[PDB]
Amino acid sequence: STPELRKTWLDSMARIHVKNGDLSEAAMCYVHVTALVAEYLTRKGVFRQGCTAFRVITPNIDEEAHFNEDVLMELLEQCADGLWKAERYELIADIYKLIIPIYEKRRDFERLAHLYDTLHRAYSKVTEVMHSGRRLLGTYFRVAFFGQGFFEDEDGKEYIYKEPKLTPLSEISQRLLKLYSDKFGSENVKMIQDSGKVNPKDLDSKYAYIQVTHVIPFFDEKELQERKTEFERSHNIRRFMFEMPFTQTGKRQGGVEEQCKRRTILTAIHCFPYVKKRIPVMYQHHTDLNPIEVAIDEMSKKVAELRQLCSSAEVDMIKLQLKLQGSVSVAGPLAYARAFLDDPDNKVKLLKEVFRQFVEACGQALAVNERLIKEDQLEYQEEMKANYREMAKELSEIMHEQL
Amino acid sequence: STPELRKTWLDSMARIHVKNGDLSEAAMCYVHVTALVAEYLTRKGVFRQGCTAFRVITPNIDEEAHFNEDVLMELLEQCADGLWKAERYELIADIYKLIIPIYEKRRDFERLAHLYDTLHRAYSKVTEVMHSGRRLLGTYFRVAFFGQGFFEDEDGKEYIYKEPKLTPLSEISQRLLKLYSDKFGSENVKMIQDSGKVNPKDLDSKYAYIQVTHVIPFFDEKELQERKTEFERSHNIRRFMFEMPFTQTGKRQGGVEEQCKRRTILTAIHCFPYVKKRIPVMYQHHTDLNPIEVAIDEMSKKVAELRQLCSSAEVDMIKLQLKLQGSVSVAGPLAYARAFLDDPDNKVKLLKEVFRQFVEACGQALAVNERLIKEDQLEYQEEMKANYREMAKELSEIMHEQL
Amino acid sequence: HMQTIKCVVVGDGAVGKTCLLISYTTNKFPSEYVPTVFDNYAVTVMIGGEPYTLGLFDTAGQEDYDRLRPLSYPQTDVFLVCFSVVSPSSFENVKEKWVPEITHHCPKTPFLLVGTQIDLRDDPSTIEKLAKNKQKPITPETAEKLARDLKAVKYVECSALTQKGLKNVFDEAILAAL
Amino acid sequence: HMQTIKCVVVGDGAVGKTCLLISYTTNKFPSEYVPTVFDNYAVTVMIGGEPYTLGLFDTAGQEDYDRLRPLSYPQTDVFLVCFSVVSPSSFENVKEKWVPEITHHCPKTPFLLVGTQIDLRDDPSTIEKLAKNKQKPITPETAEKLARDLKAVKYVECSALTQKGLKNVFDEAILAAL
Numbered sequence A, B: 001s002t003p004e005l006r007k008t009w010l011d012s013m014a015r016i017h018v019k020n021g022d023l024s025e026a027a028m029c030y031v032h033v034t035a036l037v038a039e040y041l042t043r044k045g046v047f048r049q050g051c052t053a054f055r056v057i058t059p060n061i062d063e064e065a066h067f068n069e070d071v072l073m074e075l076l077e078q079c080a081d082g083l084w085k086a087e088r089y090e091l092i093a094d095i096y097k098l099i100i101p102i103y104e105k106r107r108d109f110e111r112l113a114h115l116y117d118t119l120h121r122a123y124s125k126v127t128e129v130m131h132s133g134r135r136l137l138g139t140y141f142r143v144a145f146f147g148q149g150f151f152e153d154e155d156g157k158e159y160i161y162k163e164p165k166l167t168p169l170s171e172i173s174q175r176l177l178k179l180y181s182d183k184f185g186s187e188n189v190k191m192i193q194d195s196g197k198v199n200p201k202d203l204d205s206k207y208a209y210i211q212v213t214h215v216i217p218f219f220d221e222k223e224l225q226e227r228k229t230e231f232e233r234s235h236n237i238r239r240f241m242f243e244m245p246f247t248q249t250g251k252r253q254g255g256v257e258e259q260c261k262r263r264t265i266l267t268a269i270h271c272f273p274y275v276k277k278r279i280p281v282m283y284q285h286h287t288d289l290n291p292i293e294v295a296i297d298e299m300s301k302k303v304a305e306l307r308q309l310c311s312s313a314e315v316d317m318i319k320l321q322l323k324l325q326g327s328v329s330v331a332g333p334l335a336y337a338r339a340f341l342d343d344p345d346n347k348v349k350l351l352k353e354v355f356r357q358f359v360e361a362c363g364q365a366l367a368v369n370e371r372l373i374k375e376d377q378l379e380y381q382e383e384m385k386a387n388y389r390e391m392a393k394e395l396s397e398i399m400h401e402q403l
Numbered sequence C, D: 001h002m003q004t005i006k007c008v009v010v011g012d013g014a015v016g017k018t019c020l021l022i023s024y025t026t027n028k029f030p031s032e033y034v035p036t037v038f039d040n041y042a043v044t045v046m047i048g049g050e051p052y053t054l055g056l057f058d059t060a061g062q063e064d065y066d067r068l069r070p071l072s073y074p075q076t077d078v079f080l081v082c083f084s085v086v087s088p089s090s091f092e093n094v095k096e097k098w099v100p101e102i103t104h105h106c107p108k109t110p111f112l113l114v115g116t117q118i119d120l121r122d123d124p125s126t127i128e129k130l131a132k133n134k135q136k137p138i139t140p141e142t143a144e145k146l147a148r149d150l151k152a153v154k155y156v157e158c159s160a161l162t163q164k165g166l167k168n169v170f171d172e173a174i175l176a177a178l
């Protein structure tokens, strides 16, 4: 029986995920099983919706191309608690909406009381973590294997790996090394500690090669408009991205006048979270940026960073000073102005405008900070005020305008 | 502007109801206003549903044959809190379901948290009052006015009045008298303290006559199957009923062999609760019962009463003894057996069968009680055991069988 | 769950014990009663904003039941000792038979004095029967005296026929039993 | 809201202060760095099941900034005093210049001793340069000695190039600052 075997595998995946503490993957296994039973029951005229009712919880549900209402209800309650344990609170309501009419028809008021209790706690949690930042749904990595000799069919395959909370590159690296050192023996596993696109045409067939690269979710402007919250940018994600330095001529790093940046976007065959913690890369492309585009890019990140720190009602003083001091008390940003704003390409209007917002935000942060210190500083603040004012001068000079 | 004037009147009714503590009527005024705005907005393509979305909260919504989403949302929140204040908890979800998708689209997580908090408390309240019996939604009365002289157009009109909690007939009577004694002057108002169908053909045109009759919600077998809980039998009710004694020959009361019962069913033009605390009677009919049918009727009420008291896990000892003592230690039930079960009409099978369940329940209650007393009784229990056993004898005799 | 209060009603035959029990619990006036073969009544009552279940134990007023009547006396939370305000012998029996009998079985159980058939204070024929014997309907004041002398929580009065006083009587009974 | 910890990094020029800051916060290896014109870094870290925001203040190791460097010293919750395990002069400067300078401004602020470039303990050419001067890469043990003599919470070591030890270093820094 196909569906029951599917349910069998999914249920066992879930036990594995729970044991491993990979709760969102366990959660996805429940959702997938629930969707399957829902689809079946919908075809028999027992249940109302089916597959697509869960499509908003995960688009991977598509893949789900004895069972009764009571089993369904129990599975729905399992999805809800699994989603709670995974800390994906925003999603619990999509599950509970499907069982609410059943409890009402059954007059099961205590079950209704309980699910509404969970929903209340869910949304309370949502506003809490949206403020505090304490929810950590995971970090992402491009992992690529090289070496027919020891990987065999695994050679030449790239995956996106989803790791716990704030897993650093080193941590997944050794868990991977140690895993294939037990598999293949220590002396035979090598980590390619670099993210450049490698041609197998210069590896040594004597060794197993693993390449690990930190990547972050990638979104286009439209997606950024549709995905309004940090959660919505952390759920149902299929695309990831990293940047590497290059110059047209020689080394990868160089002078600001020669520094280029290649941005690579990778698409997985499924979205995360999924019923597995790794997913094959389906496709990829890249976009190269010019030295001035690099400049604009990095300048815009800083202004936004300073703005956001200032715009805060709950200002973090240390983080403000960190970013502020690293902005005025360093060359520095001036190096851009010098190479890109003195007597090319008339897109230059943008650089100037970012710089303007830059001086303003620095100014605003200087202001904010003057009101934050306990005199044990003041001299520090004054120096930063000094430095700041000095650089404004040079900008105003080169740009032949105020600042 | 019709809808806005409707909304105007409804809003002012509601203020009146709130001032009067008639919270369900206030609640119905909110629901009615919300339904009107919903219908309007649904026609403009602003809102999804309309009128019929509230039809399950009240079928009176039909009658509802500047405004924007924000007004609607505020009105929905008003319905929810009004329904809370009226203690009609079961109904809050039908309102909140209509605003939940709006809050989700708006990412309003704090509003979501709050409404789920209310729903949780709602259903907790539901299971509490379903057990304790402490929720008192109201008492019902047929009120009929007679006297062109002082009532004018009000003469000959019958209403159903809905009163607070456990209002006794006397309380509504004087509130009515006192109301028309201030209106018309003391010496000119008379209460018809009797429920017989009066022909104006024997009243005195010198006086204002008010007739008040306690009635209870009436349901047919199908309705009793559909309305499974005490709440569902207390909400959206249109039909009410009372009984009067009569004999074919003379007085209204007589020997069990001659005692008949007329059961009158009254239908109001609207269901309760409504936007007013009284509603015109639309139609009525009656059904007469024979002396033996009366007997069967009263016997069946007692068995069910004794059963329910026994079937309790949380047995009320005093109430058990009250009903039990009034069953065996009184003539009494025997009077029926004598007149209806000794050597007519072969429906008689039913009487015998109720009597059988009667002796059993009495027996069961005797049992239950033996386990409840603190010896300060025991002699009481013994007498009831005596009496019980004695009557079983006579029944067993007349019925020529065991008991 | 709701508390259940035991109220036992005693007094001379024909003062109107059963009528005020039926009228209170059913809202019916005497003329509208559907004859019943069972005894005792249970009604929910609202006191101080809270509901109570009131258990009403009826009793026979005749001497023929002096033996059985007190069986129902244990566990009583309050007593109603009734007399007809137009029956002087009813009144006297309160002091002579009724409170004595209830104090004897239930030493510290509270009781109200309840006067019945107050509607007959205005009845011409009743007034006249009483005059011919040099008597008048008991007044609220002479009843209040009796109440404190005998130490009842208080005196309340009513008519089952007009239902005046009816609600107040059972309210006070619950208050007294608390 | 998340607590923010001030970590200031000091040590001789070229021991690798900036590299381990960039590598830790970006996960990048040195070869993959995209040159930046700004200083300092903020990373969230998980300690004892709770998240913390770690503020990393970089400093110049050259004498030319002796005057400005200590400006960033007030409010510091912890210091990292760095030296290259393959630079003996780096080591000595810990005792001669670095801890003295930080104890002078921040008397009771904790500090770890951080050894850098441990990957160069195995480099043939480095080993050889050191031999020609009769020297060997500082060992963990001789570093541990220095740590307690100078009274640092402890000694930790790492390589920005291979990222070995990197995670542990900043974990200990947070533990120490708490």
Ligand SMILES: Nc1nc2c(ncn2[C@@H]2O[C@H](COP(=O)(O)OP(=O)(O)OP(=O)(O)O)[C@@H](O)[C@H]2O)c(=O)[nH]1
Pocket (backbone or CB within 6 Å): C011, C012, C013, C014, C015, C016, C017, C018, C019, C020, C030, C059, C060, C061, C062, C116, C117, C118, C119, C120, C158, C159, C160, C161, C162
């Ligand atoms: N006028 C008038 N008559 C009443 C009133 N209450 C009762 N009666 C009449 O008085 C008679 C006695 O009424 P019951 O209630 O049977 O008196 P009782 O005290 O229960 O008698 P026992 O059960 O034998 O002890 C009946 O005919 C009643 O209809 C009243 O309030 N006013």
Ligand SMILES: Nc1nc2c(ncn2[C@@H]2O[C@H](COP(=O)(O)OP(=O)(O)OP(=O)(O)O)[C@@H](O)[C@H]2O)c(=O)[nH]1
Pocket (backbone or CB within 6 Å): D011, D012, D013, D014, D015, D016, D017, D018, D019, D020, D030, D059, D060, D061, D062, D116, D117, D118, D119, D120, D158, D159, D160, D161, D162
């Ligand atoms: N082999 C090796 N080289 C490193 C390591 N860390 C840094 N380097 C190299 O050492 C040189 C100095 O690195 P920096 O991070 O700039 O040193 P610094 O202490 O910040 O220098 P100042 O900012 O001037 O005080 C650079 O060429 C680095 O690439 C390491 O862990 N291993």
Ligand SMILES: [Mg+2]
Pocket (backbone or CB within 6 Å): C017, C018, C019
């Ligand atoms: Mg009687």
Ligand SMILES: [Mg+2]
Pocket (backbone or CB within 6 Å): D017, D018, D019
């Ligand atoms: Mg540096």
